[PDB]
Amino acid sequence: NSSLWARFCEWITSTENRLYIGWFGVIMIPCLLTATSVFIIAFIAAPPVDIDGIREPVSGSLLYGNNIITGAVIPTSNAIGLHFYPIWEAASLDEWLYNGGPYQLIVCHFLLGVYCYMGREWELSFRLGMRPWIAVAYSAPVAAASAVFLVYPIGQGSFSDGMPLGISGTFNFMIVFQAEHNILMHPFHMLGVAGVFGGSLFSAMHGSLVTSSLIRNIVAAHGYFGRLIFQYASFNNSRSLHFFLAAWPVIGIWFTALGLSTMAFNLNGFNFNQSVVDSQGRVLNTWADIINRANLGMEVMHERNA
Amino acid sequence: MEALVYTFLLVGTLGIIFFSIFFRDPPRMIK
Amino acid sequence: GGRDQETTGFAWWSGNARLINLSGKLLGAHVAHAGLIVFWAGAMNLFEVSHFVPEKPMYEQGLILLPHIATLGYGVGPGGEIIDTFPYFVSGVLHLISSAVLGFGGVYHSLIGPETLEESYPFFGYVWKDKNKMTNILGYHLIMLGLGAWLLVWKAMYFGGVYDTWAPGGGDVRVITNPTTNAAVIFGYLVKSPFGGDGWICSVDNMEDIIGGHIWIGTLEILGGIWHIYTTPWPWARRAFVWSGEAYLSYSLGAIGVMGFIACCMSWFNNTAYPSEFYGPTGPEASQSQAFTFLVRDQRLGAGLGKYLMRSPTGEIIFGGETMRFWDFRGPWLEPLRGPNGLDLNKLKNDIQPWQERRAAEYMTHAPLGSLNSVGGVATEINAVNFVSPRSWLACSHFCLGFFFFIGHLWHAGRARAAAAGFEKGIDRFDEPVLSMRPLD
Amino acid sequence: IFTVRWLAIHGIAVPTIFFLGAITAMQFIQR
Amino acid sequence: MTSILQVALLALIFVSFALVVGVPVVFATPNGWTDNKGAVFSGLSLWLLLVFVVGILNSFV
Amino acid sequence: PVLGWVLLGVFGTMWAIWF
Amino acid sequence: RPFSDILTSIRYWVIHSITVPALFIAGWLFVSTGLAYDVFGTPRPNEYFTEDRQEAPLITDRFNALEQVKKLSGN
Amino acid sequence: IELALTLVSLVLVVSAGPLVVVLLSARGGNL
Amino acid sequence: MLTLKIFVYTVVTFFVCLFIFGFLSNDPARNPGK
Amino acid sequence: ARGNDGGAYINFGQIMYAIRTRDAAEKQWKKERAGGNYGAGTKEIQARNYVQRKENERKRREMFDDALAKFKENDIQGALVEFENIIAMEPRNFVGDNFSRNTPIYKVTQYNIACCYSMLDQVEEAIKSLDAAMLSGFDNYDQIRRDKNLSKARANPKFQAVLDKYDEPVVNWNAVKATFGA
Amino acid sequence: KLPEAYAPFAPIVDVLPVIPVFFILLAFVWQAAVSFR
Numbered sequence A: 001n002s003s004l005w006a007r008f009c010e011w012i013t014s015t016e017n018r019l020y021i022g023w024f025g026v027i028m029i030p031c032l033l034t035a036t037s038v039f040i041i042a043f044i045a046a047p048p049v050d051i052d053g054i055r056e057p058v059s060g061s062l063l064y065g066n067n068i069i070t071g072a073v074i075p076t077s078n079a080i081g082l083h084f085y086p087i088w089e090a091a092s093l094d095e096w097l098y099n100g101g102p103y104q105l106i107v108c109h110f111l112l113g114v115y116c117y118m119g120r121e122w123e124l125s126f127r128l129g130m131r132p133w134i135a136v137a138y139s140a141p142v143a144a145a146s147a148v149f150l151v152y153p154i155g156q157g158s159f160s161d162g163m164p165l166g167i168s169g170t171f172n173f174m175i176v177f178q179a180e181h182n183i184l185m186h187p188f189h190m191l192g193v194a195g196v197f198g199g200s201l202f203s204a205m206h207g208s209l210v211t212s213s214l215i216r217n218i219v220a221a222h223g224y225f226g227r228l229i230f231q232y233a234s235f236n237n238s239r240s241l242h243f244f245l246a247a248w249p250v251i252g253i254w255f256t257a258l259g260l261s262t263m264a265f266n267l268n269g270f271n272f273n274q275s276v277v278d279s280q281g282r283v284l285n286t287w288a289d290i291i292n293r294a295n296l297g298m299e300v301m302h303e304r305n306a
Numbered sequence B: 001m002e003a004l005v006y007t008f009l010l011v012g013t014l015g016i017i018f019f020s021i022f023f024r025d026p027p028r029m030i031k
Numbered sequence C: 001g002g003r004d005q006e007t008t009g010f011a012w013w014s015g016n017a018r019l020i021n022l023s024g025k026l027l028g029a030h031v032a033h034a035g036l037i038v039f040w041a042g043a044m045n046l047f048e049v050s051h052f053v054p055e056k057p058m059y060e061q062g063l064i065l066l067p068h069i070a071t072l073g074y075g076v077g078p079g080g081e082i083i084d085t086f087p088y089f090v091s092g093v094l095h096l097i098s099s100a101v102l103g104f105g106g107v108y109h110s111l112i113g114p115e116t117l118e119e120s121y122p123f124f125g126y127v128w129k130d131k132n133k134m135t136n137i138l139g140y141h142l143i144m145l146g147l148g149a150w151l152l153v154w155k156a157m158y159f160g161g162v163y164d165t166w167a168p169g170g171g172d173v174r175v176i177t178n179p180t181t182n183a184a185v186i187f188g189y190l191v192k193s194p195f196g197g198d199g200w201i202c203s204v205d206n207m208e209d210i211i212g213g214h215i216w217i218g219t220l221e222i223l224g225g226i227w228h229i230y231t232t233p234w235p236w237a238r239r240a241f242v243w244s245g246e247a248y249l250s251y252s253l254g255a256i257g258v259m260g261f262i263a264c265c266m267s268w269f270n271n272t273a274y275p276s277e278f279y280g281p282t283g284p285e286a287s288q289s290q291a292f293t294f295l296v297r298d299q300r301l302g303a304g305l306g307k308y309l310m311r312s313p314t315g316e317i318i319f320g321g322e323t324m325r326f327w328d329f330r331g332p333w334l335e336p337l338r339g340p341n342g343l344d345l346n347k348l349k350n351d352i353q354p355w356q357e358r359r360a361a362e363y364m365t366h367a368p369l370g371s372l373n374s375v376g377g378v379a380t381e382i383n384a385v386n387f388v389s390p391r392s393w394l395a396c397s398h399f400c401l402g403f404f405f406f407i408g409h410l411w412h413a414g415r416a417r418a419a420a421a422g423f424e425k426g427i428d429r430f431d432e433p434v435l436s437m438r439p440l441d
Numbered sequence D: 001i002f003t004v005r006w007l008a009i010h011g012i013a014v015p016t017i018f019f020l021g022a023i024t025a026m027q028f029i030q031r
Numbered sequence E: 001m002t003s004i005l006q007v008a009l010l011a012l013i014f015v016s017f018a019l020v021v022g023v024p025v026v027f028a029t030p031n032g033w034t035d036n037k038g039a040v041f042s043g044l045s046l047w048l049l050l051v052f053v054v055g056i057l058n059s060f061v
Numbered sequence F: 001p002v003l004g005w006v007l008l009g010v011f012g013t014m015w016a017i018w019f
Numbered sequence G: 001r002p003f004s005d006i007l008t009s010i011r012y013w014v015i016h017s018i019t020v021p022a023l024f025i026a027g028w029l030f031v032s033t034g035l036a037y038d039v040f041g042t043p044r045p046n047e048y049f050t051e052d053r054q055e056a057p058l059i060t061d062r063f064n065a066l067e068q069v070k071k072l073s074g075n
Numbered sequence H: 001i002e003l004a005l006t007l008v009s010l011v012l013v014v015s016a017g018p019l020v021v022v023l024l025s026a027r028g029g030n031l
Numbered sequence I: 001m002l003t004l005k006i007f008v009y010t011v012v013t014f015f016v017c018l019f020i021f022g023f024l025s026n027d028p029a030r031n032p033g034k
Numbered sequence J: 001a002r003g004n005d006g007g008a009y010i011n012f013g014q015i016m017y018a019i020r021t022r023d024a025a026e027k028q029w030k031k032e033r034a035g036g037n038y039g040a041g042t043k044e045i046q047a048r049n050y051v052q053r054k055e056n057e058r059k060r061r062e063m064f065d066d067a068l069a070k071f072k073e074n075d076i077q078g079a080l081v082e083f084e085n086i087i088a089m090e091p092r093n094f095v096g097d098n099f100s101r102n103t104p105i106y107k108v109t110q111y112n113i114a115c116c117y118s119m120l121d122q123v124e125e126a127i128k129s130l131d132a133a134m135l136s137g138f139d140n141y142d143q144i145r146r147d148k149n150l151s152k153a154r155a156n157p158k159f160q161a162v163l164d165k166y167d168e169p170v171v172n173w174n175a176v177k178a179t180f181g182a
Numbered sequence K: 001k002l003p004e005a006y007a008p009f010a011p012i013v014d015v016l017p018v019i020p021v022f023f024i025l026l027a028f029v030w031q032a033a034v035s036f037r
């Protein structure tokens, strides 16, 4: 009957599967599975990694005395830099582990997987005959992930600067990032915080209004909302309201990702240090100065010289 | 011994995810 | 005299989408936009030359266009000194006048003129679904780009030379006479890996390779334009592309976003097409300069080994400390001091020329670190230095622009394919594709 | 007309203009 | 001739200001471009010739 | 050159099956 | 009443035109004459470090707070 | 002195834009 | 480890060729109606 | 438009031939769709539609085989009737797994009708059927110009007009030759 | 810097760079007058 290629192609693009595969799933599925397996194995059991390249390894495996809240997959060593580090370039497997190669493996496969996941979202949207813009919404978290794992190491010149694949590792990354860069006092991070908080606000309010509407409607909910906070002609159409819901968080996350990426090239946030002075040029402190003191503490504290 | 407990909890969560994905509940009427 | 939402179907915020079919209006819009581009170019050039002092280095004043002209080798002496600033002024004025001409042309074609050019001018009028004349326009513009590249080549080889920063004893303008046309070396960069150590095409070193590559690309572009003018797409191409204005726009958006990312990386890392004398030192360059200057000052007072050099993983000598990540740096002021096994101790001890030390100190002073409100130093450093490196501005801006244009590719490509399929307006509610599928059990 | 709308608008606006003038003058204070 | 250059350049600015408002007015106004061929053509010609005049005077100095 | 050899092998295999 | 009526009204425009600038200038004068520096107790640039105390002030008192603030401030 | 000239030139130039629109609204244009 | 490198290159190139040929095999979008 | 039970409403084949030659059950689903609910009635409607589509495809394949057998017996008439029946009861809005937008047998049916009218003296309807086949995505263009059955259609210039509309020469030899000469 | 011959025209040069960003605002106000029909 039909050639083997014909049947196999029909199977991939078949829409009767429990989980759609598509032509983007051929690259997404193996990459994501590789990343998942390597991440799980490294998290559970992996030798300590010499992150700083000074023969002082950091242990982040679950078998080396870490919890779930403390375990992590330590990023590659500083000595490696931006160099490509597959298994077959390491001198030996122990050497590969000691320099944090699994982090590079996981990051690469994960990024490929997420990009192909966006593609797969689009392709199924096309197959079902709906408008193809869920991928654009998904591009925000993908952009943030790319900024954290790929762009920032490029800007800083090393892969040891990427976010560790852990929880306490995430907190350490954030604290050190604030120390080096005033992330808090950067307009794009402010836009990101506004986006997240507004997303929470809008989700809660929309859910409450819609739930209270369904009784066994839209006009009553709109009247209630208008009487509440003086907005009678705000988002009367359901389509406009749902577009606003989609747009606000996505724009916020786009801008915060761009802020992080720009900081990767050392374009820091606002710096109001000693901005206020009285006569005779004596410095009067402000809240920015206390933030500066905290940043100075964090900066000075992690500068582990040998 | 704590590593066993952590790993078992993670595996249990993954198993629940698998069950929810595949052994799904058929929709009822009205819903 | 534009259309309306009920007349066309596009809201006011989507106004420009009403020009998809009208040809004359679209052409006028494009010409006016080109006029805006050239106007900005000229105005910015004039502004920078008006706020410029030849005594200070060009990268301590926030200049991004004067460096571009300097790289071409206009009014520049050996080592990066400025001889005369007239070329910048003449370039700015010429751009401004040409922009005025373009603006008049665009305004004319947009306000008063044939909305559709196909009725009276069959040569210019077009329809998106047509494939022969779209390829004709593609070929014309390919020829124009090839002529531009060949103009650059001719300028480099004749009528002055480009600024080669790798000339001995500090760079100077030189007339390239033996550009490398070897195919293997030219395409090695394209096949070159993008990861560290290799850096795809950002690793170009000598201006000879740049000019040879431009020769090759100009020739290829002219040939491709000629080929496209006289050819129609083969069946496979017609079977694997969406042929409409929005689809072409989507392809352009994707390509230009990728090019934006490439420009970001090239500006951040490369130092031959962006000489440090004009754009300042790169990050790795600044770190290596700091380490080198510390070594030189230490050994001066004293008068791998010397507690400033170590062994790289491969096994050669590199600068030590935290700057071991930047051991791939290749600076003109430091190559003379590098041997087959990385750095060689003897040359460091004996033949450090004075000019290299001064350049290294100057680069050490101004590292690519800054603040959004134009405050130099690290973030925790107080308000004492006003400096943000031009490389940082260029890289950040063009990364952001590339990212937004990739988002644009996604959006417009999705919309184009949906519209071509025919279900862009929504689900028909009568025979929906999902209702004809087996339930998901 | 002295309905609630008038009172609310004036209560929000009069101090707003006062403060705007105060800040605009504040800009020019010699340091 | 420096003062001559300044005055000619100021006249060029003034005529440019006239053009950047009049020409869109001529185009947009219905049938306002057919009845003003000579006016706009003379304005453009004067603008171009004055540009060349300023350029050549700068060339002398 | 391992890359080149592998790509040549995979492309040839596919083409040969078809022919 | 409707927005358009008040927007195009004459009495509204005349009264607001004659009143608002007076209040803007009133705020300007409030800042400039130094009255704001006194009512709210904000020190002017010169009297931040009094001769008696050359460092930042500190209360360290609750019930006698008023007198201590009198002393710390330059009055 | 030069600062005031900058502001007056900016005011004239920025008003030159809306001037066309207002004249077309009065004189009559496509708009 | 040359064997591992060869195996990984083979798998990667196989999957990439599958991707490219699959996206070629599709037929252009068209609107049956209108 | 083909009716639910044979015939034709504005056999379908019998009527079309001469012209050219010259709620209760599916209510729960509606109520669920009125709200934003999936429910169960939607499931039974989906199952019914899927089984109907499968049965329709089966029937269309069988009657295509019937038309082929009629050709084997040299009966152009009933075979053409079957062909336009197949075309008449094609799904209204069909999106294939490979983004086809048309049932695969639709193209071959269009081509077979074009060939039938190529044998039959009347031609221009053969040109229209061939145009419909080309638009539907009859990707292979070789027997379009090689089949002896289509020589009669090839006589008319409109055949070449349509073929050039869909199959255009890749390279313009005339233009390059003229440029070389000049 | 800018040639002395054109020195008095420095302020206009300083003003030129910010002109183009006014065109989007011009389009917006033009729509406003037209009432976004």
Ligand code: CLA
Pocket (backbone or CB within 6 Å): C027, C031, C101, C102, C104, C105, C106, C108, C109, C113, C114, C117, C121, C124
């Ligand atoms: C890409 C931009 C573009 C395009 C496609 C067109 C296309 C057209 N224009 Mg428009 N026009 C443009 C730019 C453009 N013009 C500009 C910038 C101006 C301002 C000067 C005008 C002013 C203008 C007027 C006033 C008129 C047209 C007319 C026309 C039509 C007839 C062609 C013509 O002028 O005959 C001339 C064609 C020739 C081949 C003569 C020789 C021209 C040589 C080749 C000049 C080459 C210039 C060179 C390449 C410049 C390179 C600069 C580079 C460095 C950027 C045609 C539809 C006419 C028309 O019918 O109205 C719609 C008309 O009356 N145009």
Ligand code: CLA
Pocket (backbone or CB within 6 Å): C001, C002, C003, C004, C011, C012, C013, C014, C015, C016, C018, C019, C025, C026, C028, C029, C030, C032, C033, C100, C103, C104, C107, C110, C111, E019, E020, E021, E023, E024, E028, H020, H021, H024, H029, H030, H031, K023, K024, K027, K028, K030, K031
């Ligand atoms: C730079 C970007 C750009 C460009 C080139 C255009 C160009 C165009 N638009 Mg689009 N548009 C834009 C941005 C842009 N627009 C934006 C941001 C919006 C959202 C507000 C719109 C919304 C929009 C709508 C809703 C519509 C257009 C339409 C049009 C076309 C006719 C408009 C018209 O008659 O103007 C008339 C303008 C006036 C009467 C007032 C301004 C007069 C002049 C031109 C102002 C500039 C003078 C200039 C500075 C001086 C030149 C001097 C020189 C000679 C030396 C024209 C091709 C229309 C069209 O053709 O669609 C079918 C249409 O319906 N546009």
Ligand code: CLA
Pocket (backbone or CB within 6 Å): A251, C048, C051, C061, C062, C063, C064, C372, C374, C390, C393, C394, C397, C398, K017, K018, K021
């Ligand atoms: C990509 C192109 C580019 C690049 C690399 C630069 C780079 C630079 N410019 Mg140039 N400039 C540009 C485009 C560019 N500019 C354009 C288009 C204009 C015309 C408007 C100017 C006009 C201009 C002037 C007039 C001057 C400069 C100057 C400078 C320098 C200092 C900039 C500074 O202090 O940052 C300031 C940074 C900011 C104010 C932050 C802006 C951040 C972005 C743009 C905001 C984006 C909008 C917002 C996020 C959207 C909100 C969304 C909403 C949902 C909330 C720097 C070298 C100065 C200099 O030193 O020259 C000698 C100077 O005097 N530029």
Ligand code: CLA
Pocket (backbone or CB within 6 Å): C026, C027, C030, C031, C034, C102, C117, C123, C124, C125, C126, C137, C140, C141, C144, C145, C147, C148, C149, C151
């Ligand atoms: C004869 C066919 C032909 C030719 C030659 C062109 C040429 C051009 N078109 Mg295209 N166009 C055509 C047909 C053609 N078009 C048709 C049929 C249409 C459909 C109506 C269009 C629609 C169209 C649009 C919509 C647009 C163009 C644009 C352009 C210009 C882009 C210039 C640029 O940015 O280059 C970049 C590279 C360079 C400038 C380097 C090349 C340097 C020069 C040109 C070569 C050196 C030799 C030169 C002749 C000497 C110049 C001397 C001069 C200084 C006095 C270019 C001049 C764009 C534009 O902005 O036009 C102004 C634009 O937006 N065209």
Ligand code: CLA
Pocket (backbone or CB within 6 Å): C138, C142, C220, C221, C223, C224, C225, C227, C228, C231, C232, C233, C234, C237, C240
């Ligand atoms: C921006 C300029 C431009 C644009 C838009 C196009 C656009 C097009 N060209 Mg032209 N072309 C150009 C420049 C350009 N070309 C130049 C400079 C040359 C001279 C070398 C040619 C020579 C040329 C020929 C000889 C042919 C085309 C063809 C085509 C069409 C098919 C798609 C395509 O190019 O293959 C893109 C590729 C695919 C869609 C399939 C994917 C195959 C692989 C993945 C990519 C191709 C190999 C790649 C170039 C090498 C690097 C591989 C790397 C990405 C892994 C399309 C209309 C073909 C056609 O039918 O037109 C007549 C054709 O036969 N072009």
Ligand code: CLA
Pocket (backbone or CB within 6 Å): C013, C014, C015, C016, C017, C249, C253, C400, C401, C404, C405, C406, C407, C408, C409, C411, C412, C415
């Ligand atoms: C040259 C590239 C290009 C071209 C020609 C077009 C052309 C078009 N687009 Mg596309 N688009 C592009 C790039 C492009 N776009 C990019 C890069 C993006 C991603 C951001 C989009 C996203 C996009 C969407 C989401 C939509 C369009 C739409 C449209 C159509 C109407 C334009 C419109 O909204 O009116 C004029 C536009 C406006 C008045 C909006 C301007 C408001 C912006 C946000 C202000 C930003 C200012 C700020 C300083 C920018 C710097 C930010 C900084 C952080 C970098 C038109 C066919 C619309 C449509 O109907 O599609 C058919 C539509 O819905 N486009």
Ligand SMILES: CC1=C(/C=C/C(C)=C/C=C/C(C)=C/C=C/C=C(C)/C=C/C=C(C)/C=C/C2=C(C)CCCC2(C)C)C(C)(C)CCC1
Pocket (backbone or CB within 6 Å): C032, C033, C035, C036, C039, C046, C093, C096, C097, C099, C100, C101, C102, C103, C104, C106, C107, C110, E009, E012, E013, E016, E020, K006, K009, K012, K013, K023, K024, K026, K027, K030
């Ligand atoms: C259509 C329209 C539009 C747009 C448009 C445009 C974009 C246009 C452009 C235009 C343009 C773009 C124009 C330009 C012009 C220019 C000019 C007019 C110039 C002049 C010059 C001069 C005058 C100079 C002077 C000088 C010099 C020479 C240098 C230095 C010194 C001085 C400064 C003196 C819109 C969308 C908005 C809306 C609708 C309407």
Ligand SMILES: CC1=C(/C=C/C(C)=C/C=C/C(C)=C/C=C/C=C(C)/C=C/C=C(C)/C=C/C2=C(C)CCCC2(C)C)C(C)(C)CCC1
Pocket (backbone or CB within 6 Å): C186, C187, C189, C190, C201, C204, C209, C210, C212, C213, C214, C217, C240, C241, I020, I023, I024
């Ligand atoms: C000048 C220069 C140089 C060089 C240059 C060159 C050599 C270039 C080349 C270039 C090239 C060589 C390019 C290429 C490109 C390619 C591409 C870009 C591709 C793409 C693809 C795509 C896009 C696809 C798509 C698709 C598919 C896959 C199939 C079907 C479907 C679709 C269509 C979707 C040198 C270095 C010497 C020096 C420096 C500078």
Ligand SMILES: CC1=C(/C=C/C(C)=C/C=C/C(C)=C/C=C/C=C(C)/C=C/C=C(C)/C=C/C2=C(C)CCCC2(C)C)C(C)(C)CCC1
Pocket (backbone or CB within 6 Å): C090, C093, C094, C097, C098, C099, C101, C102, E051, E052, E054, E055, E056, E058, E059
């Ligand atoms: C002031 C100054 C100066 C100047 C000079 C001169 C002499 C200038 C001129 C200028 C000019 C004199 C300009 C012009 C421009 C033009 C343009 C920019 C055009 C364009 C065109 C186009 C673009 C076209 C296109 C087309 C046509 C129409 C044909 C065919 C088709 C086509 C589309 C291709 C001097 C050095 C003495 C001194 C310093 C300062």
Ligand SMILES: CC1=C(/C=C/C(C)=C/C=C/C(C)=C/C=C/C=C(C)/C=C/C=C(C)/C=C/C2=C(C)CCCC2(C)C)C(C)(C)CCC1
Pocket (backbone or CB within 6 Å): E013, E016, E017, E020, H013, H014, H015, H016, H017, H018, K019, K022, K023, K025, K026, K028, K029, K032
């Ligand atoms: C180069 C030159 C020149 C030129 C100039 C020009 C070209 C100009 C243009 C100009 C313009 C073109 C302007 C425009 C303006 C506009 C405006 C000023 C607007 C405004 C608007 C607004 C403010 C709005 C608002 C609003 C809101 C708030 C929301 C949205 C919408 C609306 C409307 C409602 C001059 C003469 C300097 C000098 C000579 C040389």
